[PDB]
Symmetry: C5
Subunit: 310 residues, 5 copies
């Protein structure tokens, strides 16, 4: 008969989501109800019926009694877990009540930048029983597991949280319990609008104004400068993200501007070629194309992407 | 009858307030008076009436006597708390005197950048009893809890400190004590004046001087360069702050300049268009507008913000 | 007669490969089966036949019985190893079952940047018995040692994993066991294409378009600007890597552009020299060379490297 | 009768002085002579008369004997103190000899940037007795406390060290001992000369040379470029320092250049205005002012500061 | 009679040499043979003749027997030392065999940047006996102390390693043992050639080509731009190094270029002054100087340094 273990995991804080290293960090409380008959005791009245134990001596106790604790790992933990509380309460009955507060970092291998910055993502913590389900079953501690209401995370905003149980075969080849706390968040795009999109559109629009000057040299010098500008924005954006082998939506948008800008140069080179060759008045005829290919090439662009990537 | 616990928390240092990660860090002393009748002892004369204990053995003592300690957590702690002292003194009476010095980082989810850089903010530490108020009540240790007077924090300057008690329901569903040390600080704006405001005004004013040259090409080249300048200041400022989904006052000020600057380009494009079209003397007439739209567009700006955001 | 130790090492995560410091970091589980008859006990009917031990007390047990544990080191460990689990299970038989989960960083002195960014690399962890092979032999725990399938590492992609045994003479001058987990990964070049190659080609190609303007001044000013651009890319790339004493393929590609660009200047200086000397129409004759030396000098370049370094 | 405690604190290394966070870091040894009669023991002749103890068991000893240790804190410690040695030697007499080696970071709230980079500063470590001077008095361990002669700190250079005693009232309201190790260092200005002063003077002087070209356009374009240059130097320097609410000497020097440069623009705008208005030969007359206002405005500057801030 | 202690220190890795903070970091094994007759034991046929001990219980053993351990410190250790192994083996004879693996950072106050980047440097670790040479003598454990051949450090390359013994007077005023592991390394200059020297020479050489255009304006604009370029390289290089009060060879090389570049401006200003004054054909005569002062001023420079600093 497998004895049941009641796994609660609440997340008081999201300290931060480092999307470049594909992890997130949380202040969290873990809560475990586990009844061991064998840990039951009897108290004379005037001696409390609930014992309070440092995990340190609670385990040194289980080791004397050679009782098995339902040993667990956080499977997607990264680095150290700076514990605040590791505290046992034990009723006459032998119901163990373990609480574990901590800061730690966790793997988010659930990261899909395909649609960056528009993407929504899955963050999850895996609590695994080391021991199989013949010995210990994880059940859902009720009215606890979830996300608190002072997470302090400004870029992301959490759509929904789910709790569920399932199995693994990590160290055992017997099926073992895995309690899972999943949450999706999606990205507050203000930052991106404000720092990336708005500037780029300013640069593109102001750039276009200088077309009404009808100086093709000054257009080419301008468009050439824009190129480096975008190539910069290319490095601003690259450094938010990993060295992905896959192509972001952002990546398209930029290479988009690159292509246009290069052809703005090439086009105005050829308009300027015609002034150089005594066809000034023809270049002036063709000019109206050049002037209304700018906004259309960049709006043809807005639907090359918004279709291809939506 | 719940036995009372006397919670003092002093802050010797503000090591720093990291506003990008929305936390702060402090060197702090915690002080607890808690009388346990059962911890009372009797001393032969020539043996001190005050026992001095490593927390390590003080808890191993409480575990022998199966006495409950008023276990607490720092609810808004982030990461590890590098303790210096964890020291118990115990009178014949059984009055426990716990002292806990530490450096730690703390969540400041109280962060309102709406008015950055002019904002004032709330920093607070939450000390929670794990156990309900049926067992332990937190009371305010008098003549201790507050902030020291070499905090060493130069950007912020602390308006006031408040201490008060209240409840939580973190692990228990019984009401539990929470001792709170709140402080407000506000921001020394020297840095912002010196590095952001002064430059931007210089750039804007000097820029304007070159209008009296009456070269519309040279105005457009100039205003176009200012744009990138501001777009830079846009990234200087962005990196002090998180990737907020909300719009700073700073954010406005910049997008403010962006809008004007773009229209400075557009306007001087059109003045220059008139020289190109044999209306040089008209463009020269209109010029006085162009020359006194600069200072007014940027002072119309000073009240677009100072109203919208005050 | 040496007692055998059964060494399993699985890698649940690659937290990251820091190629500048020539190390990598992993979440990993170590598993050891080791039968000590002397640890055998009697599994009295009704009493559990499997003892569960904190490493802490398991070693304090071996120290009472003065039994030797097969002490091991991770030979290529760097810094601290933040352990999650260090857990012993011991049958009546005296079969010790040690599990050790951890995050740690590891030396990758196997790093060959000669072909960066095209290179493939060897990452390996060395688990050494401190004690010789007269006392303890490492054997391969079967159906465990390998790499998990949520590593979360986006730039690298793992070709293959190998496990094998061998010896060392680190502290002993007697031969000692070394269990080795090797893996090769190779680099997703998207990043490099997207951020380095594409831009550089844009700069080079757009640059070339402005040749059809037939302004040698404007070519020289342009090529001079490209130089600094590349010199920048030289610092972008330098800082992904160590301060190598050996010359990358990347290093060549850049110095490649440098050489061409400098000679583009020198060539167009001399074309412009001829306009200055009343041989405008000759410079115009020679121009066709200048215009079709650009694409050929940079494609002569594409096979100076692709041969020299392949 | 208060028993005396003999406090030695030597600083083997200055690991570094982080002036932006207003702290410094040191490798240090602490040494304490403290005679407890009650810890005295009797040596049967041929048995050693000096006991050597891990602090771990030395305190577990004091806890058995319920003897009070003269518990101390480092009052201006920041974060963790990575101890190397914590070692007790105890003679027949009962003379405790505690040694404590460590790396730690310390608050330097003694930081006066008013004269940066010319400033000299106070670094100090506070060792406080937790217990009052009715129980324990701190006295100066002689021929130990000071600074070593391989600190390895290159920017600062230590003028003098002082050791002295005083009181506090941190946790007690009884007077308590505080042993203090103060040192002043002052700043090797080479760095500042080499990277800040020399460049700025070059920029200013070379800039001035181009005046002898008598092109007022080319002066205005030049002075405008200098402005951004200085605005850069403004950010180089700002980031060495905190976000001070007070105004550095450095801050003046820069805003100095800003003011001049802006008025260089304004002046040459007006010289150029006169060429635009058919008064070319007058602008040429006035020119000699413009040419010898540059060196005088920037040398009028050298005594606006060298007086105001000396 | 002082009992002898046999000190071996091997360095498996150089994790890195941080030259800006003047330290280095190493994975290392420490090995100590120390015979204590008093720890000698006798066994029945069955119990091994070599006892294996956690340092934890080995010291708790020495504390029972009140035996003195030859306590040591790493004198030039910085921060924490993340230990992997701390393992005692003890023969019947009472020969203690302590092994200590670790990562730690170490002071290199042996740092002479005078000749940067050409400099060679001394790295050393100091292992000190706390106790004098009346009690414990350090002797050299043979066939161990040295450096391994997978250090993994790419910029430096180790010339030679030395071991020797000597004394200190750190805490004692009696002479005490200090085992020293010294190594010299020198710097792979590839990085510096590739990123600093090559560019600077390109900039200087290409710059010179544009002289054959015979446009003194375009030379002055060019040389002025070079200045800022070098002033940038001045900040690249400054930040590899500390804020030394002493002047690098690098520092000279840069200030070298600064001086020349400024005088290139000044000279071409004066050539251009002569065109402005109707002496165009004279400036053209003098030009040949200007054109062959560039390569000579910068090669006169190559021996101003290579003599002054060699
Ligand atoms: C690239 C294709 C078409 C021409 C555009 C090139 C730039 C136009 C003039 O600006 C200059 O650009 C340099 C690098 O290009 C900068 O280093 C320099 O400070 C800037 O003054
Ligand atoms: C840039 C959009 C604004 C266009 C309006 C005319 C402004 C032209 C001046 O800026 C130029 O821009 C390039 C990058 O675009 C820079 O490389 C170059 O140093 C700079 O001289
Ligand atoms: C801005 C100061 C106003 C006073 C007059 C000086 C004119 C200088 C404007 O050209 C600048 O050229 C740089 C090329 O390196 C650009 O990067 C920069 O954006 C652009 O503004
Ligand atoms: C070096 C090869 C010969 C031609 C190019 C000369 C040096 C680099 C060109 O960029 C220059 O750099 C400055 C920004 O740093 C600008 O102020 C300047 O106007 C711009 O043109
Ligand atoms: C390895 C775990 N930290 C040990 C533990 C697990 C469950 C309970 Br209930 C108590 C202790
Ligand atoms: C910080 C730990 N909860 C330990 C503790 C022990 C005693 C008292 Br009084 C308060 C707390
Ligand atoms: C050095 C290791 N941490 C100690 C140890 C090794 C092997 C086994 Br089986 C148990 C404990
Ligand atoms: C809190 C300190 N770690 C305890 C201590 C202080 C002084 C001496 Br002497 C020994 C121990
Ligand atoms: C500082 C060390 N913890 C003490 C030590 C040194 C040497 C030997 Br042998 C054993 C212990």
């Amino acid at each position: 008969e497998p004895s049941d273990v009641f796994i609660g995991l609440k997340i008081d804080q999201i300290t931060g989501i480092n999307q470049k290293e594909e992890n997130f960090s949380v202040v969290g409380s873990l809560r475990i109800d586990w009844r061991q008959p064998l840990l039951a005791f009897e108290h004379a009245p005037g001696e409390p019926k609930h014992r309070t134990y440092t995990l340190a001596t609670f385990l040194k106790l289980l080791e004397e009694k050679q009782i098995r604790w339902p040993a667990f790992t956080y499977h997607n933990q990264q680095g150290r877990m700076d514990f605040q509380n590791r505290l046992i309460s034990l009723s006459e009955d032998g119901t163990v009540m373990y609480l574990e507060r901590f800061t730690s970092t966790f793997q988010a291998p659930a990261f899909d930048f395909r649609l960056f910055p528009f993407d929504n993502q899955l963050f999850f913590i895996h609590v695994d029983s080391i021991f199989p389900q013949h010995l210990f079953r994880f059940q859902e501690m009720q009215g606890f597991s979830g996300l608190g209401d002072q997470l302090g995370e400004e870029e992301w905003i959490v759509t929904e949280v789910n709790t569920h149980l399932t199995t693994h075969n990590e160290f055992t080849k017997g099926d073992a319990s895995r309690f899972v706390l999943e949450f999706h968040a999606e990205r507050h795009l203000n930052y991106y609008l404000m720092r990336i999109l708005i500037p780029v559109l300013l640069i593109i629009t102001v750039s276009w104004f200088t077309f009404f000057l009808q100086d093709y040299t000054k257009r080419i010098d301008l468009a050439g400068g824009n190129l480096l500008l975008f190539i910069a924005f290319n490095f601003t954006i690259s450094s938010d993200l990993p060295r992905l082998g896959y192509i972001t939506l952002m990546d398209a948008f930029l290479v988009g501007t690159f292509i246009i800008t290069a052809l703005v140069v090439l086009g105005n080179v050829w308009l300027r070629r015609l002034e150089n060759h005594g066809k000034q008045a023809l270049a002036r005829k063709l000019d109206i194309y050049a002037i209304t290919s700018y906004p259309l090439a960049y709006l043809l662009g807005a639907l090359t992407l918004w279709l291809l990537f939506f």
